[PDB]
Amino acid sequence: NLKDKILGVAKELFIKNGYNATTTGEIVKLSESSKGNLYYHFKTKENLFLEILNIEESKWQEQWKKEQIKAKTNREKFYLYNELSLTTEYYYPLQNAIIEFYTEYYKTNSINEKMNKLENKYIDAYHVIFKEGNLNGEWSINDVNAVSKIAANAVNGIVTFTHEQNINERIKLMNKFSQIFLNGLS
Amino acid sequence: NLKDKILGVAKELFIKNGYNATTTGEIVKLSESSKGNLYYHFKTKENLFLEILNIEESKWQEQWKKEQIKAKTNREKFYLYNELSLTTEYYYPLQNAIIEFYTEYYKTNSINEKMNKLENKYIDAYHVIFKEGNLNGEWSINDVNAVSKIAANAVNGIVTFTHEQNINERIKLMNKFSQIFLNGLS
Ligand SMILES: Cc1cc(N)c2ccccc2[n+]1CCCCCCCCCC[n+]1c(C)cc(N)c2ccccc21
């Protein structure tokens, strides 16, 4: 494909280097397409990156729906989602690139809108789990949105800031975190 | 002292122009030193920057040592340290150079090793709060080292990935997080 091999080489570059480290020159010299091509579907470079995120959050959310069956209670789904978070090949590997990205486009207005459209997708899985768990009598959260937002970011914190220590050490901490947290809700 | 003039000047240069754009030549001339002296004390730009981070971590510890006295109990120190990490990062000028430097050097083991020492010093403050809270009966935690690493990265996530929200909402969520988490310990 064309408008799909771009998105591919781009994802690979944003991860391998960083957001700025990868230039449109590079994406082209390895995705072979005149500068203009990258201009139709993808208006700007911040469009191509914001595009990659959407796909990634979708592939990830999709992977979780196909794996969440292995958890019977919402309590178990919480532990599971946070554990799988450390291993997916989806979305989470772009978090550094996203931190970089936001530091260099937070002076524009169309940024806080798109970076907040994704926010809703990103915390959705937690919203389901906490609401569904309210319905299933697993706990009683008065402010579901607040808690989903906290859970999502705290977890994104664990996944992102421990990216060097042995993987099983990380799963261990994440489980202790999921424990402290749900225990905190009831 | 010349070493300190070099560090002071380099810090300001990194802040005004960012990590990559600052040249050691600028650092050399503006501090009235030499490539030789700079090489002698730091070996490289990356090292210089890491040394600056060291000093910054120490000033931060000193500031905390003076601030925590406002918080009688450890439950309070925890609430306060988490709020301080969120509010003071909003206007910490080196933050930008820091993002730029990390999301570009976490691949090297030389650098990522030294960064971990820094990170570990930040985590220590949680260790102290948690150990001290044990000896005071504020809670009973059997795995202080672990809970400390979890708290630190959870908080960093909340501080780091929540930037699009309004400042009061972020402070509301950080406190709710502190409340949930401290409640999950008992
Ligand atoms: C004085 C002073 C004054 C303040 N008002 C202040 C305010 C807020 C914070 C520190 C402050 N300090 C001093 C602060 C010194 C901070 C030194 C930090 C070193 C390490 C960064 C580690 N790191 C890791 C592990 C993992 C990541 N994925 C990652 C991603 C992006 C960026 C960094 C990353």
> Which residue segments constitute the domains of chain A, with CATH numbers given?
1-49 (1.10.10.60), 50-186 (1.10.357.10)
Alpha-carbon separation of residue A47 from A11, A38, A43, A98, A101 (angstroms): 13, 10, 6, 13, 12
**Ligand 1 center from residue B98 Cα (angstroms):** 7
Alpha-carbon separation of residue B50 from A19, A48, A150, B117 (angstroms): 22, 33, 31, 11
Q: Do A17 and B104 touch (CB under 8 A)?
A: yes
Rounded distance between C-alpha atoms, residue B131 and residue A171, angstroms:
24
> How many CA atoms lie less than 13 Å away from A123 in the CB half-sphere?
21
Rounded distance between C-alpha atoms, residue A88 and residue A82, angstroms:
11
Rounded distance between C-alpha atoms, residue A101 and residue B64, angstroms:
30
**Region of A44 on the Ramachandran plot (φ > 0 left; ψ -120 to 50 alpha; else beta):** beta
| Residues in chain A closer than 8 A to B98 (CB atoms) | none
Determined by X-ray
Rounded distance between C-alpha atoms, residue B31 and residue A9, angstroms:
43
| Residues in chain B closer than 8 A to A96 (CB atoms) | 102-103, 106
The residues, any chain, with a CB within 8 Å of residue A41's CB and separated by 6 or more, are A3
- What are the tokens at A166? 């042995």
Q: Do A182 and B182 touch (CB under 8 A)?
A: no
- A119-122: list long-range contacts, CB under 8 Å, 24+ apart: A119/B164, A121/A57, A121/A58, A121/A61, A122/A57, A122/A152
Type of residue at A162:
T
- What are the tokens at B62? 């000193």
Rounded distance between C-alpha atoms, residue A85 and residue B78, angstroms:
26
Resolution (A): 2.5
Rounded distance between C-alpha atoms, residue A30 and residue B17, angstroms:
31
